Amino acid sequence: ERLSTLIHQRMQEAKVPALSVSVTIKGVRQRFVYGVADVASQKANTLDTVYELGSMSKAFTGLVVQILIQEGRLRQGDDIITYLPEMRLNYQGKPASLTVADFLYHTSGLPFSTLARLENPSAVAQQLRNENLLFAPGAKFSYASANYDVLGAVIENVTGKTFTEVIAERLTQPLGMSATVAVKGDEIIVNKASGYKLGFGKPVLFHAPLARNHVPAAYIHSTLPDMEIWIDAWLHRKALPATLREAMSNSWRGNSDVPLAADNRILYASGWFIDQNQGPYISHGGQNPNFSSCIALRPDQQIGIVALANMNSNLILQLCADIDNYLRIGKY
Amino acid sequence: ERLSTLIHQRMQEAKVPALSVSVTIKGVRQRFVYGVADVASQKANTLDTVYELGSMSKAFTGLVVQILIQEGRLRQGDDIITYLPEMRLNYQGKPASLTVADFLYHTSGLPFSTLARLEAVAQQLRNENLLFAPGAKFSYASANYDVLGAVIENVTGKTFTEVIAERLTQPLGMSATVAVKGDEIIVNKASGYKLGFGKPVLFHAPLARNHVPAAYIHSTLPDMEIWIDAWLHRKALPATLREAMSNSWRGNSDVPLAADNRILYASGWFIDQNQGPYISHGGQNPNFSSCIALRPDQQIGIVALANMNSNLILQLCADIDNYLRIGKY
């Protein structure tokens, strides 16, 4: 009956050691901070606890891409080969032509093997060289985390800077997100939560080293209060420099130019799923071997929901939807 | 690259003996009639071939319910108990209160086993244990619309078959469309097949009268074309049927939605706003499968009917819609 019941109940059901949730509706915001950030050392999860964003990193990457487009430095229809010259990929008999848009919207065709290759700690172009596409570029929407790693390399090539520096200079600094960072690699982050991989029970895993190339697709780190700032930025675009406002509108534009299933006509935007049903409802989950998270926005009602958890859990990916139901009709 | 390629490709993939498809866009309509209604006797699929509509039936039942509502004889909020006094259902410890809307929108909580059981309805479902409290969740159960058949009969005082004919099939001019009373021979009915390992006939089994409203309506390609055109073009339709039709497409928003599904259920239709309104339903009996989809903004109407049960046929309307929408699939 109570939101706090819903969230607490789902946390126990998911067996996550720490859960952090923030929910805002019509300018009223409640926080839910639960559990321990490190089971063995008994360190309680707090507002300062840092969580890997997994695939929720893609919205930061996509927004930067659209900032560059807004400023005229890049175009969606640009051939990928200009920014990643050495990257050759093949469809059937003949090397395939690919655009920046194909990675933005997951219409590239990159094989499923390319995730466990990009997570492995060669530059991305040589890392994906002589790959075989699952389909013709543009033909279908297939989700592949590696697509946004390709976009990281684009951002560096065009910028002439590192991904971390762009993220900070373009997004984190101007927005005031002081605990959010695109990690360079294995170097330690203070206040960070330990990550767990479920089954049979939650044993620690965090330690495995993080591939630099995969950061833009899966390795941005953040906190609940910074994610709150991120949400409020997307909900309240005004008071932001015209460039960012326009890049944000364009970021939420879904690619309609793909086949849609009978039960699913949702589109993918620049690191977001866009759903018109009881919408606009804009969302994305994150799943990493040892972290999981979700975010959902329903601007028409100024609704913004984010959940961050130190364990990989399919329940966490459904959690933002459950909260949204409770807000929409008092039921979940 | 060609619609004809798409449909024919999908028919080979699905291994359906007969497939009939009709597609209309911007008042241009193409028909695709393939295969044999009966494999053994080599009887070719033809415009007159009759196919079971499975769950497609539900839109006929739902529209009739909405016709009764429009006339004032019925209301969504009515207690089911008034029409089916004998049918008493329980949730947890104690008996649970059910409305007409619960069956219309599949928020009743009827257990899964009931389908195989419906294959009077109230004595049939007496003592049933609800999966959840009425209204709490959307859970599709074919039997929900069988309850609505019994409601239509009790309100009308007529049989389900007579109402469907008098209210819908006769006025709309659908000659070959009928709600089957009990097992009895239908002239032109295609034989039904069950896949696997290779599809042999499943024809013999007898049809439960109680289940007709949910999955037992029979029809033809040209009649389904008339049905589609009636939903797409409602002018020249009596005011009551027009209003019933608008109300039939109103989805029930009062249920929890999954992260990847925000689609609503209407009165025997799924209502999708994405690249929509896009209204669809699929039918799947042991030995028949079918689909239908409408995208009115573009006067688009698609129907497929097949004499074998196939998950591919359920996706076939969406493939065609993709082809129409973006020339790809």
Ligand SMILES: *[B]([O])([O])C1=[C][C]=[C]C([N])=[C]1
């Ligand atoms: B991403 O690949 O980490 C990802 C994980 C879980 C859900 C979604 N949508 C993306």
Ligand SMILES: *[B]([O])([O])C1=[C][C]=[C]C([N])=[C]1
């Ligand atoms: B119905 O239960 O026969 C049915 C079958 C297949 C799909 C849908 N939507 C309903």
